[PDB]
């Protein structure tokens, strides 16, 4: 097959700046009829691909004019003259000139913005869940930037490892921030055998680690 | 306006079968080649199948030849994909698309899971808001949707009325082979007694539909 190589694979951009995606084909892309069938797609989280550019440089009807395609031979380029927040997501090039259709591996466009600090919340196990035999302690980091953040768990001030899973949202289409949850999972037994539950949070926006904690037994 | 509406995806054992459906509207369906394109999880797009206007030409990517057959019914505006001998790597979102290699319009996707595990509905537990949310500040409240299989679950708040401030996280696979997510929402502390907060948790694989009220605990 043709191999389409995209670069950079992750493209951080200050809002309002130019941004450029490359697509290097391992082959020329001119079909026997003389035409180059190269497309660009944008894909937003949990959404189907939206066609931005077709035949190297033609823009579809919906598409703002800050998007443009160009190139020939084996290098092609997608080009966002003025990046906006809505433009975060994954962009794919796609060649159709040689069987079979192949996609690039996709470039993620992320916004570079000012450092914002995580608002931390902690939630105890619900009493409904304790009635079944498991305790989920949920620790929430809201609306922060950049993405990197460490959540440590402590039970009666003993550090925990191997019993918490993280989940992080995609970059917000409006304010360009992330959010992260950490869930600590324990048996009913162990949860009832301990008093103080804390999640410590380190992050650039935090001059010192924020800790939120509660005590079992309506705190 | 061109619409491609897909259906038929779900959980199926290795070696089993499943039938994807695409129903279109807004255009002359019989004028177009149609095409299926799949997206492996956290993954790239892969072309899967072509089918000409009347069904007499059907082409498939190599990894699926002999196992998938496309079909179409032009009087019903309908395009199908018969999946057979499914493998672990056939997992992903399957997209209906119009007119390769232009691909100008895409269906909304339909998720295919190839797994031994069997369906299981979620549990919905309230994440109740901290008793010590600032006097005139922000309070966070939420819903833990736990131990379900397979994906997707959909979580809305107040039947779609509460919309800003909502964060539904990506599902996470636990060591028990089941999925779990939380959905949170930040709201004025002033309204915690005033406004009622219901999280609508839909999980169609198991036909689970839950409305859980999230309230200050005391």
């Amino acid at each position: 097959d043709v191999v389409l190589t995209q670069s950079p694979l992750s493209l951080p951009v200050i809002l309002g700046q130019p941004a450029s995606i490359s697509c290097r084909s391992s082959q020329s892309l001119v079909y026997s009829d003389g035409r180059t069938y190269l497309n660009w797609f944008q894909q937003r989280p949990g959404q189907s691909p939206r066609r931005l550019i077709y035949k190297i440089s033609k823009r579809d009807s919906g598409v703002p004019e800050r998007f443009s395609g160009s190139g020939s031979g084996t290098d092609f380029t997608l080009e966002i003259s003025r990046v906006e927040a809505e433009d975060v997501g994954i962009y794919y090039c796609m060649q159709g000139s040689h069987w079979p259709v192949t996609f690039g591996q996709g470039t993620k466009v992320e916004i570079k913005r000012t450092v914002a600090a995580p608002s931390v919340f902690i939630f105890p196990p619900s009493d409904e869940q304790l009635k079944s035999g498991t305790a989920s302690v949920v620790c929430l980091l809201n609306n922060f930037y950049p993405r990197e953040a460490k959540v440590q768990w402590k039970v009666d001030n003993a550090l925990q490892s191997g019993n918490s899973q993280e989940s992080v949202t995609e970059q917000d289409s409006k304010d360009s921030t992330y959010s992260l949850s950490s869930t600590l999972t324990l048996s009913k037994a162990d949860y009832e055998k301990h008093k103080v539950y804390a999640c410590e949070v380190t992050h650039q926006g935090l001059s010192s680690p924020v800790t939120k904690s509660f005590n079992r037994g309506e705190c | 306006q061109v619409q491609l509406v897909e259906s038929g995806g779900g959980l199926v054992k290795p070696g089993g079968s499943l039938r994807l459906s695409c129903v279109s509207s807004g255009f002359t369906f019989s004028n177009y080649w149609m095409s299926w394109v799949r997206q492996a999880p956290g993954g790239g797009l892969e072309w899967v199948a072509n089918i000409n206007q009347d069904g007499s030409e059907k082409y498939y990517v190599d990894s699926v030849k002999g196992r998938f057959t496309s079909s179409r019914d032009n009087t019903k505006n309908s395009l199908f994909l018969q999946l057979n001998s499914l493998r672990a790597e056939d997992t992903g979102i399957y997209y209906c698309t119009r007119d390769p290699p232009y691909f100008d319009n895409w269906g909304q996707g339909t998720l295919v899971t190839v797994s031994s595990a069997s369906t299981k509905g979620p549990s919905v537990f309230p994440l109740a808001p901290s008793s010590k949310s600032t006097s005139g500040g922000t309070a966070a409240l939420g819903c833990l949707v736990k131990d379900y299989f397979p994906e997707p679950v959909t979580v809305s708040w107040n039947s779609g009325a509460l919309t800003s401030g909502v964060h539904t996280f990506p599902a996470v696979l636990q060591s028990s082979g089941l999925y779990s997510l939380s959905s949170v929402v930040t709201v004025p502390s002033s309204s915690l007694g005033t406004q009622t907060y219901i999280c609508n948790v839909n999980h169609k694989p198991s036909n689970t539909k839950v409305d859980k009220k999230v309230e200050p605990k005391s």
Partner: peptide, 20 residues
């Protein structure tokens, strides 16, 4: 025309002729 007068996109694999 630098290529062909009307477009003819490849929607099927190529099937070369190797026989009489």
């Amino acid at each position: 025309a630098t290529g062909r007068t009307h477009s003819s996109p490849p929607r099927a694999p190529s099937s070369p002729g190797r026989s009489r």
